[PDB]
RNA sequence: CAGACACCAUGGUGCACCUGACUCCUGAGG
RNA sequence: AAAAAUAACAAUACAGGACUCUUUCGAGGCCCUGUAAUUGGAAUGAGUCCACUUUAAAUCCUUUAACGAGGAUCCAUUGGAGGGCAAGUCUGGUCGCAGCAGCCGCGGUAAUUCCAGCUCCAAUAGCGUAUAUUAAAGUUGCUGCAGUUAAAAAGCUCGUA
């Protein structure tokens, strides 16, 4: 049908200081690679351009009003932006970090069963949590406000309760085959 | 180990007033448009949060009577991140000496650069209020203000100057020779300073003029001479 | 240079001129004013309270300044034999 | 110029032989290696020792 | 500057720009199809040929070396071209009538290095990759 | 200003080179 | 084009810093990052697989009894590290040879450009290369070019479109 890239490649391939900056973001927020950072760079740039367009439209104009409100509402739903600010001027001031902080991984750190921004990502990818009664396997995700009230253990990781898989049973048989000697 | 030292020697009214603290900032001096010929004045009012960046260390030369001769030409730029910047060029026999002199020269030349906005008016200046252009040798750099979160879109050498200038958001276009770096920095230096030289309608409102600090402090500044 | 309703941006407010209506910028050379003393008149003997005129680089290099000062001084007073 | 005669080929390779160090450890995969660079450089040993120094510099 | 700018002068600007466009060397060669006619790349990107002969080339100064090229007649284009053989001691694996995949160099349409009349480089010998032979990932099958 | 004023050609090459942190450390005393 | 695995967490052995004690040295101290020695639980599908599901009938997915990680492994790559250009004032080998080299230039014996090894860098299930076209390019200049001398005002005037 139709497809599109979710990331962007900048015009200078080596730019040492920037490469370091990008590595630091990866460290802080537990990411896979530069493509993860580029993924946010693509989204953020489009949001700023959206904002900037609206801001140069005439005031009290249906298009500016309707799409303004929509852009604001979306950014507040995911908890990047706060609605005590709530106009175009403030949206421009947002940066890469503000998005990353509202991801599933960084919530799984902040509460629950991760010990690091390391651990968290591996926990999500190995299906140790449900967000509600719904497993989430994607760490780069961005949870909404009231979805951070339902992050909890899964019933398909058998610690935190759940049906025995073959990893709990593996540990059982280090006591009944490792120490059972058979 | 090694450690610095500082000493004040006045040869002028301005040096004495600064140390006595009848002048508390460079801004007063800039307003009156009086020269600064003592590095100590800049050191005393600031002397912290002053970053010196050597832009290039490039040698040049002239031919002496018997064989060659060569010397080092250094470009140093200085500035706080609060809207004050300087540029100083010095040429000396060795690399180290050329940079050492260049730093002193850079401090002396320190000039205010006006900071303004793209269109905003709340949340404090992030760019310039007017597009300013500067030319050096047929290189022309044009600075254009940019809105927040855009960042500085410039070549590395102008970007560093803009950073110190307090312009965190800027569009640039530079046209002309791109092989030459001393010219490129100089042209950007001309541009940033030009923001004060523009008369905006927010700057129209007029003032009754200084009575000069030389005249007013005349009695004070008898120490053994006025 | 104000922002908003009258918030202060700005590093300082520069001097202006009235001999060509152009600002004295930012550290420029050949930029100085000119304090003429007032005399109280009638009993003579200087009393304060300076009259100050602001002279810019521009006017001086274009050799205007001599005439300008007289126009400025006369228009607002006061010197004997006008 | 134009010429016609090949002479000597693989002269340097005819007297240089390769060898191998094998592994104490694997060269690290994806995400783990990317994280490892940031920790090894910065959070260790928080940098306070030395200056002006490369990751492979003999300077 | 030096152009017309009235209120009806659209036609004059439109045609004047078109007329002057042709002067530029980069433009002209491509638009007159010269690039295809003279050089075998332009209208192709890669081309396979049969090896005519192996040439030793006593490289023109500066730089003192025997550069060592092959001469290839491309099947598709039908043009005889001398192409550089890169990689160290890799001349060897070429044989007369054994094919090679040839590709352009990097200047595009013009000679490279210190050697004139060569503006192309070999990429595969025996259609199985010179690179793979040099590394020793793959063996010469022929 | 205002005395005299002529033939004469030819000839080759490389390395000029780039960063900041004051001790002989005093070493009876210290 | 999309998602982003190939391990994560403690312990100890160390290299480290806020905190405390001590005049300091030194020691304790939490957070850990790496590097040993191996581990300890604790986890997961890549494979494997009853069953349920899919579907025209099937396949695969999404669903799951029973299995599947202590390590040089269930074991990632492709180019670069003289300049532009990120990363070797590398070690051995060669010595204007073989090669390198878009371009600038290296190599003629103490080669930081080669050829291998080692280390490091960049991007990372992708990366290199060739080529067309686009951007950068105000090097086609409408917005927005240049023409005294750098490439460029017709010998001059009349004059219609």
3 state SS for chain A: CCCCCCCCCCCCCCCHHHHHHHHHHHHHHCCCCHHHHHHHHHHHHHHHHHHHHHHHCCCCCHHHHHHHHHHHHHHHHCCCCCCCCCCHHHHCCCCCHHHHCCCHHHHHHHCCCCCCCCHHHHHHHCCCEEECCCECCCCCCCCCHHHCCCEEECCCCCCCCCCCCCCHHHHHCCCCCCCCCC
Report residue A46: phi and psi, to 5°: -75, -40
Nearest to C33 among B27, B196, B209 (CB): B209
Q: From the CA of A144, how many Å to the nearest CA of chain D?
A: 26
Per the CB < 8 A criterion, the answer to whether B92 and B101 are in contact is yes
Do B122 and A92 make contact, defined as CB atoms within 8 angstroms?
A: no
> Could you give all domains of chain B from N- to C-terminal order, each with its CATH number?
13-112 (3.30.160.20), 115-203 (3.30.230.10)
Which residue has tokens 């590394």?
Answer: E135
Do D42 and A30 make contact, defined as CB atoms within 8 angstroms?
A: no
Strand F nucleotides within a 7 Å radius of protein CB atoms:
16-22
Domain count, chain E: 1
What kind and span of H or E run contains C54? none
For helices A62-77 and A34-56, angle between their N-to-C axes, nearest 10 degrees:
150
D51 touches strand G (CB under 7 A): no
3-state secondary structure of B142: strand
**Residue A27 included in any domain:** yes
CA–C1' B206–G57 (A): 91
Q: Is the dihedral of CA A160, A161, A165, A166 positive or negative?
A: positive
Which is nearest to E51 in space by CA: E124, E138, E106? E124
CB-based contact, D53 to chain A, within 8 Å:
no
Per the CB < 8 A criterion, the answer to whether B33 and C24 are in contact is yes
Domain count, chain A: 1
CA distances from B59 to A41, B93, B97 (A): 41, 10, 13
Tokens of B170: 């800027």
Tokens of A180: 């059972």
Q: Classify residue B121 by burial, with Cβ atoms within 10 Å: 0-12, 13-18, 19+.
A: middle
Tokens of E128: 């199985």
CA distance B191 to B140: 9
CA distance E61 to E55: 18
CATH number of C1-82: 3.30.1230.20
3-state secondary structure of B100: helix
B63 touches strand F (CB under 7 A): no
Strand G nucleotides within a 7 Å radius of protein CB atoms:
1-10, 15-17, 32-36, 40-45, 63-69, 72-73, 75-77, 79, 81, 85-90, 92-94, 96-103, 105-108, 114-125, 129-133, 137-147, 153
CA distance E18 to E34: 19
CA distance B88 to B109: 7
3-state secondary structure of B148: coil
- Please report residues of B whose CB lies closer than 8 A to that of C26: 30, 33, 111-112, 114, 193, 196-197
Q: Which domain holds residue A48?
A: 13-182
CA distance B143 to B126: 14
Residue E137 CB-half CA count within 13 A:
6
First and final CA of chain B: distance in angstroms? Answer: 42
CA distance A17 to A22: 9
Q: Is the dihedral of CA A59, A62, A64, A66 positive or negative?
A: positive
Nearest to B147 among A52, A94, A95 (CB): A52
CA distance A144 to A73: 12
Which is nearest to C52 in space by CA: C25, C32, C30? C32
Nucleotide nearest to E102 (CA to C1'): G130
Tokens of A17: 């200081």
Region of B49 on the Ramachandran plot (φ > 0 left; ψ -120 to 50 alpha; else beta): left
Q: How many helices and strands in chain C, by DSSP H and E?
A: 2, 4
3 state SS for E76-142: CCCCEEEEECCCCCCHHHCCCCCCEEEEECCCCCCCCCCCCCEEEEEEEECCCCHHHHHHCCCCCCC
Which is nearest to E118 in space by CA: E142, E82, E73? E82
Tokens of B207: 């003032």
3-state secondary structure of C80: coil
3-state secondary structure of B133: strand
3-state secondary structure of D51: coil
CA distances from C58 to B119, B136, C63, C68 (A): 31, 22, 9, 12
Per the CB < 8 A criterion, the answer to whether B128 and B195 are in contact is yes
CB-based contact, D15 to chain E, within 8 Å:
no
CB-based contact, E119 to chain D, within 8 Å:
no
Question: Helix %, strand %, coil % for chain E, to 5?
Answer: 25, 25, 55
CA distance B184 to B155: 10
Residue nearest to nucleotide G66 (CA to C1'): A166
CA distance A44 to A105: 19
Alpha helices, H only, chain C: 57-61, 65-76
Residue C54 pairs in a beta bridge with none
Tokens of B11: 């040869």
CA distance A165 to B168: 55
Which residue has tokens 């025996």?
Answer: E126
Tokens of B51: 């970053």
Report residue A79: phi and psi, to 5°: 75, 10
Q: Is the dihedral of CA B165, B168, B171, B172 positive or negative?
A: positive
Nucleotide nearest to B3 (CA to C1'): F22
DSSP secondary structure code for residue B181 in this structure: S
Tell me the resolution in Å.
5.8
What kind and span of H or E run contains E39? none
For helices A16-29 and A34-56, angle between their N-to-C axes, nearest 10 degrees:
100
3-state secondary structure of D2: coil
Experimental method: cryo-EM
């Amino acid at each position: 049908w139709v497809c599109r890239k979710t990331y962007v490649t900048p015009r200078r391939p080596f730019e040492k200081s920037r490469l370091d900056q990008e590595l630091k973001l990866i460290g802080e927020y537990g990411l896979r690679n530069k493509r993860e950072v580029w993924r946010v760079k693509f989204t953020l740039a489009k949001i700023r351009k959206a904002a900037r367009e609206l801001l140069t439209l005439d005031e009290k104009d249906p298009r500016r009003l309707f799409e303004g409100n929509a852009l604001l509402r979306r950014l507040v739903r995911i908890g990047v932006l706060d609605e005590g600010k709530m106009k175009l001027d403030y949206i421009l001031g947002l940066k890469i970090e503000d998005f990353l902080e509202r991801r599933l991984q960084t919530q799984v750190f902040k509460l629950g069963l991760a010990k690091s921004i390391h651990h968290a990502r591996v926990l999500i990818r190995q299906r140790h949590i449900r967000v509600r009664k719904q497993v989430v396997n994607i760490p780069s995700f961005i949870v909404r406000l009231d979805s951070q009230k339902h992050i909890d253990f899964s019933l398909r990781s058998p610690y935190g309760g759940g049906r025995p898989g073959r990893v709990k049973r593996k540990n059982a048989k280090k006591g009944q085959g490792g120490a059972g000697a058979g | 180990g090694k450690a610095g030292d500082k000493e004040w020697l006045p040869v002028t009214k301005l040096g004495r007033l600064v140390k006595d603290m009848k002048i508390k900032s460079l801004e007063e001096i800039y307003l009156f448009s009086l020269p600064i010929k003592e590095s100590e004045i800049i050191d005393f009012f600031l002397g912290a949060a002053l970053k010196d960046k050597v832009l290039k260390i490039m040698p040049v030369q002239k031919q002496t009577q018997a064989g060659q001769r060569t010397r080092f030409k250094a470009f140093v730029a200085i500035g706080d991140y609060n809207g004050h910047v300087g540029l100083g060029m010095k040429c000396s026999k060795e690399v180290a000496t050329a940079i050492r002199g260049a730093i002193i020269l850079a401090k002396l030349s320190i000039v205010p650069v006006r900071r303004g906005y793209w269109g905003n008016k709340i949340g404090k200046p992030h760019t310039v209020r007017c597009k300013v252009t500067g030319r050096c040798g047929s290189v022309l750099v044009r600075l254009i203000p940019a809105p927040r979160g855009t960042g500085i879109i410039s070549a590395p050498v102008p970007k560093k100057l803009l950073l110190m200038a307090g312009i965190d958001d800027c569009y640039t276009s530079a046209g002309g020779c791109t092989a030459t770096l001393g010219n490129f920095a100089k042209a950007t230096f001309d541009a940033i300073s030009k923001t004060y030289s523009y008369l905006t309608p927010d700057l129209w409102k007029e003032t009754v003029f200084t009575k000069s600090p030389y005249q007013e402090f005349t009695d004070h500044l008898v120490k053994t001479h006025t | 240079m104000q922002s908003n309703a009258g918030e202060f941006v700005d590093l300082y407010v520069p001097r202006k001129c009235s001999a060509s209506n152009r600002i004295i910028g930012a550290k420029d050379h050949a930029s100085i004013p000119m304090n003429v003393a007032e005399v109280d008149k009638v009993t003579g003997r200087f009393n304060g309270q300076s009259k100050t005129y602001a002279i810019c680089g521009a006017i001086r290099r274009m050799g205007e300044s001599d005439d300008s000062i007289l126009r400025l001084a006369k228009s607002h007073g006061i010197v004997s034999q006008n | 110029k134009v010429h016609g005669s090949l002479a000597r080929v693989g002269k340097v390779r005819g007297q240089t032989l390769k060898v191998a160090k094998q592994e104490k450890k694997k060269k690290r995969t994806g995400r783990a290696k990317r994280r490892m660079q940031y920790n090894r450089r910065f959070v260790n040993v928080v940098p306070t020792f030395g200056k002006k120094k490369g990751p492979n510099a003999n300077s | 500057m030096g152009k017309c700018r009235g209120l009806r002068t659209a036609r004059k600007l439109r045609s004047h720009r078109r007329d002057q466009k042709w002067h530029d060397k980069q433009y002209k060669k491509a638009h007159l199809g010269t690039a295809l006619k003279a050089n075998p790349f332009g209208g192709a990107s890669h081309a396979k040929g049969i090896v005519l002969e192996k040439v030793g080339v006593e490289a023109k100064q500066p730089n003192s070396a025997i550069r060592k090229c092959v001469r290839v007649q491309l099947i598709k284009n039908g043009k005889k071209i001398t192409a550089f053989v890169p990689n160290d001691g890799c001349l060897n694996f070429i044989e007369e009538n054994d094919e090679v995949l040839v590709a352009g160099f990097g200047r595009k349409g013009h000679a490279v290095g210190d050697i004139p009349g060569v503006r192309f480089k070999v990429v595969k010998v025996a259609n199985v990759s010179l690179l793979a032979l040099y590394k020793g990932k793959k063996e010469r099958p022929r």
